[PDB]
UniProtKB/Swiss-Prot annotation:
Keywords recorded for this protein, A-Z: Cytoplasm, GTP-binding, Nucleotide-binding, Protein biosynthesis
Localization per Swiss-Prot or TrEMBL: Cytoplasm
GO cellular component term of the entry, any: cytosol
Portion of the full-length sequence here: 377 to 634 of 634
Example GO biological process: selenocysteine incorporation
Species classification: Bacteria, Bacillati, Bacillota, Clostridia, Moorellales
Function description: Translation factor necessary for the incorporation of selenocysteine into proteins. It probably replaces EF-Tu for the insertion of selenocysteine directed by the UGA codon. SelB binds GTP and GDP.
Name of encoding gene: selB
GO-annotated molecular function: GTP binding; GTPase activity; RNA binding; translation elongation factor activity
Protein's name according to its UniProt entry: Selenocysteine-specific elongation factor
UniProt family annotation: Belongs to the TRAFAC class translation factor GTPase superfamily. Classic translation factor GTPase family. SelB subfamily.
Chief location category: cytoplasm
C-alpha cells in the first residue's frame, strides 16, 4: 500500500519498537521521508517517538502506555517497601523491568516521563513524581525522636556513632533515616559525622552574622560565640564556607551570604 500504511504495519510488527534506520530500510523509504511520516503519525497520536539523541525510536502508543504501567508497579512496590529511600536505582529499574529495551531507549524513556512530570529523577534513582512516604507508627516515632535529639542538641549535635548507639540502630538503618530527614529539610548534613537540626543551623548562622558584624573572625571566636567545642564548630564553618555563607579571607572569615 502507501508508505504510511507500510510503515504503520512495520511499527506494529515490532513489540519493543524499532529505531529510525530499521524502519526506513524495511519500508524502502529514505531516512528523510521516514522521519516525515513518523513525525506526522506521532502528531496523530498513533505512534510515540522517543528522541534518542539525534536518532529516533518508534513504538506503538499502546506499548508506550504499557511501559508506563510497568514503572508504576515497580515504583509502587519499591516505595511501599522502602519509604525512607528516595527511589529505585536507575539500573535496577532497568534490568528488572526493561531488559528487553536498548539502554539508550530506556534512558530517553525516563527523560520523557520526567519531562511530563511523572517521575522524580535524582542521582541515579527513579521515583514517582507524587511519591508520598507511608510510614508505620513505629517509623513515625523514630523519625520524631530522631529529630528531637538533634533539635535539643542545638549547636552540639550528637555524632553519627553516638546516635547509632543511643537508639541502638545499625549504620545502614540510621543513615537511611537521617538522609530521609535531610530530604524533608529537618536536618542538614555538615559532614559524614555531623548532622544539624535545620532550625539550629539557622540560629547558628545568625550567631555568626552577629560575630562577623564587627570584623573578620577566627575559629576560637566562633567557638565562644556558639558556646560549642571546636569539634562541632570547625566542621560547621567549613560547611558554611561551602554554601558560601562564610568566606575565608586570610586566616579569618567574613560573612558573604544572607
Ligand atoms: Y534527550
Ligand atoms: Y595565613
Amino acid at each position: 500500500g502507501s508508505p504510511e500504511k507500510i510503515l504503520a504495519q512495520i511499527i506494529q510488527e515490532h513489540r519493543e519498537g524499532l529505531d529510525w534506520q530499521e524502519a526506513a530500510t524495511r519500508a524502502s523509504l529514505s531516512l528523510e521521508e521516514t522521519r516525515k511520516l513518523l513525525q506526522s503519525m506521532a502528531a496523530a497520536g498513533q505512534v510515540t517517538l522517543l528522541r534518542v539523541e539525534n536518532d529516533l525510536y518508534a513504538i506503538s502508543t499502546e506499548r508506550y502506555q504499557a511501559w508506563w504501567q510497568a514503572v508504576t508497579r515497580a515504583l509502587e512496590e519499591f516505595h511501599s517497601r522502602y519509604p525512607l529511600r528516595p527511589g529505585l536505582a536507575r539500573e535496577e529499574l532497568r534490568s528488572r523491568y526493561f531488559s528487553r529495551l536498548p539502554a539508550r531507549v530506556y534512558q530517553a524513556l525516563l527523560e520523557e516521563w520526567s519531562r511530563e512530570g511523572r517521575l522524580q529523577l535524582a542521582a541515579n534513582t527513579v521515583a514517582l513524581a507524587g511519591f508520598t512516604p507511608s510510614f508505620s507508627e513505629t517509623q513515625k516515632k523514630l523519625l520524631k525522636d530522631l529529630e528531637d535529639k538533634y533539635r535539643v542538641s542545638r549547636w552540639q549535635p550528637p555524632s553519627f556513632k553516638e546516635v547509632a548507639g543511643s537508639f541502638n540502630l545499625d549504620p545502614s538503618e540510621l543513615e537511611e533515616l537521617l538522609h530521609y530527614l535531610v530530604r524533608e529539610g529537618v536536618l542538614v548534613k555538615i559532614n559524614d559525622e555531623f548532622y544539624w537540626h535545620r532550625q539550629a543551623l539557622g540560629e547558628a548562622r545568625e550567631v555568626i552574622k552577629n560575630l562577623a558584624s564587627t570584623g573578620p573572625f577566627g575559629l576560637a571566636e566562633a567557638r565562644d560565640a556558639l558556646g560549642s567545642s571546636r569539634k562541632y564548630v570547625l566542621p560547621l564553618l567549613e560547611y558554611l564556607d561551602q554554601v558560601k555563607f562564610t568566606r575565608r579571607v586570610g586566616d579569618k572569615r567574613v560573612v558573604v551570604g544572607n
